Amino acid sequence: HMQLVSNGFEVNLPDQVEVIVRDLPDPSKVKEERTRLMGYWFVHWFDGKLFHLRIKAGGPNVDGEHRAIRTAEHPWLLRARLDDALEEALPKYAAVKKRPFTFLAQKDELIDAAATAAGLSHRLLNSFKVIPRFALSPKIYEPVDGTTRVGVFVTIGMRYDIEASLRDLLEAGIDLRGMYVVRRKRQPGERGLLGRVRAISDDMVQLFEETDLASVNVNDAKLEGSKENFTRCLSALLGHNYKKLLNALDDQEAGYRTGPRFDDAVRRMGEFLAKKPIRLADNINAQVGDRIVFSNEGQARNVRLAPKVEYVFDRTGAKSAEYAWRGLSQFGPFDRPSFANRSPRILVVYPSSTQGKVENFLSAFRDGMGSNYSGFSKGFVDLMGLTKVEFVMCPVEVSSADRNGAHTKYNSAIEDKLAGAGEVHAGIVVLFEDHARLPDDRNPYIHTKSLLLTLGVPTQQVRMPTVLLEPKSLQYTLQNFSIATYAKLNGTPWTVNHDKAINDELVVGMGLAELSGSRTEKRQRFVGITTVFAGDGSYLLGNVSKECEYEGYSDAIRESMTGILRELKKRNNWRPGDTVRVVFHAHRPLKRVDVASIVFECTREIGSDQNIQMAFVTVSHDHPFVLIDRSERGLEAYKGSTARKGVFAPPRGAISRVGRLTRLLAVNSPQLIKRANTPLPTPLLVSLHPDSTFKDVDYLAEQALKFTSLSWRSTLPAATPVTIFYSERIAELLGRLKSIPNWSSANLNIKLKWSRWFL
RNA sequence: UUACAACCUACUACCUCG
C-alpha cells in the first residue's frame, strides 16, 4: 500500500549520553548494584559490562571509566531507560506490568457501561470488571538500512477480572464446582493458580487439581478472569438477560478495538506523552515525535503490496483462481487427472441412535445439498471428479451418558466390522459432544484415530452438533470436511503459485505441541516436521514426520534436510552450477549453533558442484506492531449495511519493513474480517536469522503468505504457514497417540505416506 | 473433534550475551 500508519511514535533522543562503565563478568551482582544505586543512577548490564547513567545529583558514587555512548550506535541503552521513564512520565497510572509499562484506564469500566446500555442490573455485577489496558513498548527499528531509531509502540487490550468474594458467589447460588481459582495477591515469583473448587465449607475453599496446598482461605483466593468463569457466573446471575450483556459488551470493546477507534486512541496516547518532554535524567530529555509510518518517501523503501496468491489447479497454470472454493468448484482438484482411487470405500462409525442424522449428513456430503445451498450444491463425488463413494456403515451401541466405556465400544465395533469387510480407504467417525473432551485414556476421538491410523486408514471425525448444523452453516462445513477428506485419501486439492527462479527449493517447518491431562500437571513437549518443495510453477507438499520426541529436535531438522536434499539431487539431477535454496520456518528462532551445524551438514551433503542458499525464519503472532491503512473504508458487514467491517485494515499481502532482518505481513484483509465489531487485525512479524546465507526477507514474507493459502483444512487461509501449522497438528496428534494402548506409527510412512492424515 | 476468526485467562519458556 502507499502509506501504512503504525501504532508507534518517534522518540527524539539526545544524540549521546555520558555514562560510567565497569567490567562485571558475573551478572548476578547486578541486582545488588541496581538497588544500592536506586534513584541516583540508571544501570544496565550488556556484554559483560555494567553501564551507569546518572539520573540525578548526589548519592553513592560509582567507579569505572567515563564513556560517551552515541545513541545512533547503541540504541539499547536509552531503549531500556525509556521503559522506566515512560512509567515515570505517567505517575497517576500504576504499572500492572513493567517492560513494557502496562497500565489500566483510570475510569473506563465496560461491564458497567454495557449493563447501562443494555438496561441491566444485578447487585454483584459491579464486582465483574473489564478495564482497558494499554502498554507502551519502546522498540528499535530502522527506517532506512543502517540507520536506527527508537519508537514507542502503543497496544490496547482488556483486563477481565472477577473481584467478587467466593462466599458471595456461592451465596447468590452459582455453582463454583470445578472453577479455577487464583491468589488475590501474588508475591515475587509466587504462583497465581491454586487449583479448582471442590467445596466451600467454613471460611475455606477445598481444592482439587491443587498446585501446592489442598485448601486456601476464601479471602486469599478469587476466580480467574477467564471467559469460562465470566459466562458461568453471569449466565447464572442474569439468566436470559445474559445475552443482552454479552452483545452490549461486544459493542463496548469495538469502541476501543476497530481501526478508526484504535487509531484515535493511539493518537490520544501520543498527544498525552508529547505534551511534556519525557525526562531520561536530571538534565536530559526525550520527546515523543510524529507517528511512524511505513512509506517509500525520501529514499526510504519501507512498504510493498505482494501480488494476490493464486490458487492453482493444474500442473501448468491455465487454471488459477483468487479463492480456493471458487477455483475448486470450477476446475476440480489439482491432481484430478492422476488421482488413483475413483471409488473410495469409507467406513462410517457412529452411535446407533444417530443413524437418521448421520444418513442425512452423509447424503449432503456425498451427493450435495442441491441448488438452494450454492456453497455446496454438487457433493463430494462431483466436486472431486470421483466415480462414486461406498459407505460401510458401522453403528456403535453407545450412549452419550457413558463416560467410561465409550472408547471401548467404538473400537470393538470397528474391529468387528473391518474383520468381515474388505479394504477401507478412510473413515468418518461421528462423536457425541459429551465424549469429545473426555480424558485420553477414555476418549473415543483419540482411540478411534489411533486404531484406524495403526491400520493405515485416515479418519475425518465430526461431532454431533456439527452433523446437526442448520443448512446455511452446513454448506461451509461440508466444503472444509470435503477438502480434508480428499487430502486424507492422498489427493492434492490445490497448490499455490510460485515463480520459477532457482533450480529447486525446499521449505521445512517445525511445530510444537505441549500436552498434559490437566492444567496442574507439567506439559510435555512434542514436535512435528512438514516439508514443501517448489514444483513447476507451484508449491507441493512433501512428506511429514512420524517421530515426535522433542529431545534432539535440531538433529531431526538436520536429518530431514540432509535426507531430502540427497533424494532431491538424485531425482532432479542437478547440474554443476545450479542453486538450491533451503528455508526453515518456526514460531521461534533457532540457536546460532544449530544453524551452524544444519548449514554445515546441508552444504557437505549437496557437495561442491552446486551453490546452496539457506534461510532460517521466525514467524511471530504476538508482538507490539499494528498497521493501519487510513485509505481503507472497509466493507459493508453484510448486504445493505451502514455498518462497516475491516475499516482501516491493510490489504492482504502488505509487507512493511521494520529493520534489515524484519518485516510485517498483513494477512487479514477486510474481505477476511468476520464482522463489524472484529478488531483491527494485527500483522505477522517475519524475522530472518542473522546467520542465514539467503538474505531476502521480502521474498521470505511473501512465501510465508503463500503458505497460509496452502492449508487443506479449510477453504479459508490458515493463521500461520502450513510448514508450522501442519507440524503443530502432527505434534499434538502423535504426542497424544504415544500414550494410547495398541497405537503404532508403523503405517504412517507406508499406507499413509501420501495421506494428509493430520488435517 | 468441519473450520476460520476474535478475545481472555493461565502457564511459563525461548533466544542472545557473559
Place this chain on the structure above:
DNA sequence: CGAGGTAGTAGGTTGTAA
C-alpha cells in the same frame, strides 16, 4: 547460571464461512 529482550502454548466462549 543470570541479565536482558522477547513472546510462546493451552484451553475456554462467541460469531461467521474471502
